[PDB]
Amino acid sequence: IQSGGPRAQIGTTDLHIKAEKLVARFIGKEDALVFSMGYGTNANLFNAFLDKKCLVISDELNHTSIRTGVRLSGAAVRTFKHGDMVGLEKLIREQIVLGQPKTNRPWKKILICAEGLFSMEGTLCNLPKLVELKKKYKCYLFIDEAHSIGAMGPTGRGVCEIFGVDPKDVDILMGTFTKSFGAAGGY
Amino acid sequence: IQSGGPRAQIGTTDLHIKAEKLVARFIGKEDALVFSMGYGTNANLFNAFLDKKCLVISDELNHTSIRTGVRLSGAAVRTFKHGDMVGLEKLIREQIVLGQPKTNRPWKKILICAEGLFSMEGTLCNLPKLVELKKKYKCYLFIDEAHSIGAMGPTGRGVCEIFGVDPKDVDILMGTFTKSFGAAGGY
């Protein structure tokens, strides 16, 4: 029941490797990592791959962990009304045109954050149209499948199975084992 | 008394090579070209090395040939009042900040055009301060020594000799043999 330390120092075992391989095969992607907390995952991801010259366009109903993780990095934030895609496209166009505030230089990067299922409304996210705009405007996509994985779809793979979307158009997928697997952690 | 054709086709002789070498040695630069007209030189230079995403900051008293050459290329033009350097620095700063019009992207290039001696006022150009700002703000310098070369300076080299400026801070120097050499052409 005792760990050794960080994964980089001594903490890794073969069980971690097996779990990562099995999760990656289950989702349909190439590789995966596992952590000991979902809140920590969402809080420490964006700090790692973002900066203060980038932009994040996230839904207004996102979880608190995503907000904390984005706040820790330094990027700019703009939100669109929940379940509205014309507003999303309009915001994307306007923010590409305007550029960085007070300097008007081109945005170095644009990331879109959403959720597979919002667990206060019960609604889904319009994944096919999100893929359409991300391909058209060269954005990136981040999806949080905390409540979708394991419990939705014909065989339980989430919203990609529900909408028939190939799980290669989504740049980063993350979820937790807490909701529908009776365990703890994230990936 | 007959030429053959363009310099690229058959028109070159050894006399052209000797003249280019001697002019380059006389001015103090590394290499030079000679043409058959000064108006044509000024009209066809900027078309060759400029574009529509660049900016030209020229004095308000420049010759007509410079204006035609700049107009033929497509670049944007802004002028500063004659004999005023605070306005020049202010314009440089504002135009670097603002960027390309209606798009606000960074200026791809900035070129400053002046004259060694303005042959309607009799005044010179403040070469040392022009060099100071071009070095400070990373601009480029173009000088038109039509009336200065041959007839000004301790030994007749122009405004570089008058101000003691090393003729390496000036990116492009051009003049004519019409005024003070009793001939025709330009370099």
UniProtKB/Swiss-Prot annotation, chains A, B:
Localization per Swiss-Prot or TrEMBL: Cytoplasm; Endoplasmic reticulum; Membrane
Task: Provide the positions where the record notes the PTM N6-(pyridoxal phosphate)lysine.
Answer: 179
Report which superkingdom the organism of origin falls in. Answer: Eukaryota
* Family per record: Belongs to the class-II pyridoxal-phosphate-dependent aminotransferase family.
Its quaternary organisation is:
LCB1 and LCB2 encode essential subunits of the enzyme and form a heterodimer. Component of the SPOTS complex, at least composed of LCB1/2 (LCB1 and/or LCB2), ORM1/2 (ORM1 and/or ORM2), SAC1 and TSC3. Interacts with LCB1 and TSC3.
Miscellaneous note of the record: Present with 54500 molecules/cell in log phase SD medium.
Q: What does this protein do?
A: Catalytic subunit of serine palmitoyltransferase (SPT), which catalyzes the committed step in the synthesis of sphingolipids, the condensation of serine with palmitoyl CoA to form the long chain base 3-ketosphinganine.
Instruction: Please state what the protein is called.
Output: Serine palmitoyltransferase 2
- Give the gene symbol: LCB2
